[PDB]
Design a protein around this motif. Structure first.
Motif, PDB file in Angstrom:
ATOM      1  N   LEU C  73       0.794  -1.222   0.000  1.00  9.15           N
ATOM      2  CA  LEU C  73       0.000   0.000   0.000  1.00  9.15           C
ATOM      3  C   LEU C  73       0.846   1.302   0.000  1.00  9.15           C
ATOM      4  O   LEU C  73       0.334   2.367  -0.009  1.00  9.15           O
ATOM      5  N   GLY C  74       2.155   1.171   0.097  1.00  9.19           N
ATOM      6  CA  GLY C  74       3.113   2.313   0.124  1.00  9.19           C
ATOM      7  C   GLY C  74       3.500   2.837   1.469  1.00  9.19           C
ATOM      8  O   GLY C  74       4.072   3.867   1.577  1.00  9.19           O
ATOM      9  N   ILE C  75       3.282   2.006   2.505  1.00  5.22           N
ATOM     10  CA  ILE C  75       3.565   2.349   3.858  1.00  5.22           C
ATOM     11  C   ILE C  75       4.674   1.447   4.378  1.00  5.22           C
ATOM     12  O   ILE C  75       4.681   0.203   4.177  1.00  5.22           O
ATOM     13  N   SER C  76       5.623   2.053   5.068  1.00 12.13           N
ATOM     14  CA  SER C  76       6.707   1.337   5.717  1.00 12.13           C
ATOM     15  C   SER C  76       6.301   1.252   7.182  1.00 12.13           C
ATOM     16  O   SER C  76       6.416   2.185   7.940  1.00 12.13           O
ATOM     17  N   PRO C  77       5.820   0.037   7.604  1.00 10.85           N
ATOM     18  CA  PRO C  77       5.261  -0.162   8.951  1.00 10.85           C
ATOM     19  C   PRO C  77       6.339  -0.537   9.901  1.00 10.85           C
ATOM     20  O   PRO C  77       7.496  -0.812   9.528  1.00 10.85           O
ATOM     21  N   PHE C  78       5.959  -0.516  11.162  1.00 16.13           N
ATOM     22  CA  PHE C  78       6.882  -0.810  12.235  1.00 16.13           C
ATOM     23  C   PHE C  78       7.183  -2.320  12.372  1.00 16.13           C
ATOM     24  O   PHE C  78       8.339  -2.735  12.478  1.00 16.13           O
ATOM     25  N   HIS C  79       6.162  -3.119  12.403  1.00 20.55           N
ATOM     26  CA  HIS C  79       6.354  -4.510  12.725  1.00 20.55           C
ATOM     27  C   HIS C  79       6.682  -5.379  11.571  1.00 20.55           C
ATOM     28  O   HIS C  79       6.246  -5.151  10.441  1.00 20.55           O
ATOM     29  N   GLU C  80       7.417  -6.477  11.837  1.00 18.80           N
ATOM     30  CA  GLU C  80       7.627  -7.476  10.814  1.00 18.80           C
ATOM     31  C   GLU C  80       6.355  -8.294  10.533  1.00 18.80           C
ATOM     32  O   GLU C  80       6.096  -8.630   9.392  1.00 18.80           O
ATOM     33  N   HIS C  81       5.696  -8.703  11.581  1.00 15.40           N
ATOM     34  CA  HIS C  81       4.488  -9.453  11.452  1.00 15.40           C
ATOM     35  C   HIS C  81       3.773  -9.345  12.770  1.00 15.40           C
ATOM     36  O   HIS C  81       4.331  -8.818  13.702  1.00 15.40           O
ATOM     37  N   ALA C  82       2.554  -9.806  12.831  1.00 13.97           N
ATOM     38  CA  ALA C  82       1.900 -10.010  14.059  1.00 13.97           C
ATOM     39  C   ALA C  82       1.908 -11.470  14.373  1.00 13.97           C
ATOM     40  O   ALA C  82       1.619 -12.266  13.538  1.00 13.97           O
TER      41      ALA C  82
END
Lengths: 116, 116, 116, 116
Positions: C73-82
């Motif tokens: 979606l073009g977002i660099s999120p914090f987590h690797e996975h949940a």
């Protein structure tokens, strides 16, 4: 400080800065009357809303102006505001932190009530 | 359904049954007019609140009576209720699911919005 | 279904589609053995992971690949996975719904457990 | 303090005290190796896990021993632990707060990443 508000931004992973917060207290005639307000700081917090003397038992509403916050970031939000409604209870000494975790289409709110 | 409400209990890991829900719509004189109400079923859901015809554009408030839910389980919770306030249908009819996840001193609420 | 996973996107107010999910079961030698996997559908759900017969007592890990979802979606999120880790079926067969509500720097996960 | 953990109890509305927290770092050989650990304080926080020198870029896991916390309170929980897995990225100066909000059958985790 018997009452603090803390607001976090779940999209950016940051405190939510410059968020307007309005506090109301329910009057004898059952309407919401303005009680305190402010804008969150750089740490996402709003201190100094009230004093022990003024913060008597009663029903309070904290309104967090989430929509304006998202709009400022260019992100389309769902809610008009986040509303937290609670009864203050004298139960020995108490400090209330009203925390809010914001996303565009979701928020959580938690009360952390401690005894200094 | 244009409007559905779903409520979950984070303590028990179960749907929240028999939760009262009241829906209001902001009137032209800026008062909250009663719009619809009901109670969640065994799956924690409330269906049938309104119709596409009745559910016009406006600002709506979904009030979830969380306090009464907790008290019936033997818990004295923090909040009076959960309030969810939002503009609906302002770019045409949508379907809204208002979800809430309840704990005694915390709740979250999420909207899932789809275009039929 | 004895095990279902549901994933919602708190940014867009929508189900999270095409999210990869990997399920593991702790083996006798305390390693995580692959158990099942799949991807969420258009309603944000993943069905058909297992069967009542195969889904024996054990410690399971549900890994939700949130990072890949956000990045697309073009977002660099914090987590690797949940990661969701839990004992299952230890007082007999149950049905488990593992829900997750995603934001780029935050997620929540809830279990709804029912007895068929 | 480049890394702090904060844990809140959504049932009692309180910091979660005496919660064990273990931090791991992913080694060159792809296994999780112990990095830091501790127990939360009265304010629900764990400070002093690492230093700027030691906290190099890499993949970290924070495991929060939620099950033991609930068990101590006599409340039956769902999860074995809460797991937070992320990449530390040098992106200018940064401080990471890993927050967790606990319920028996649900938790949320948020990363608050700031620049002192």
């Amino acid at each position: 400080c018997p009452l603090m508000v803390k607001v976090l931004d779940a999209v950016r992973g940051s405190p939510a800065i410059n968020v307007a917060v309005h506090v109301f207290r329910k009057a004898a005639d059952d309407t919401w009357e303005p009680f305190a307000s402010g804008k969150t700081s750089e740490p996402g917090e709003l201190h100094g809303l009230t004093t022990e003397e003024e913060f008597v038992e009663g029903i309070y509403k904290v309104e967090i102006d989430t929509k304006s916050y998202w709009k400022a970031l260019g992100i389309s939000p769902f809610h008009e505001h986040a509303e937290v409604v609670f009864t203050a209870n004298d139960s020995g000494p108490r400090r209330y932190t009203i925390a809010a975790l914001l996303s565009p289409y979701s928020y959580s709110t938690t009360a952390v009530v401690t005894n200094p």
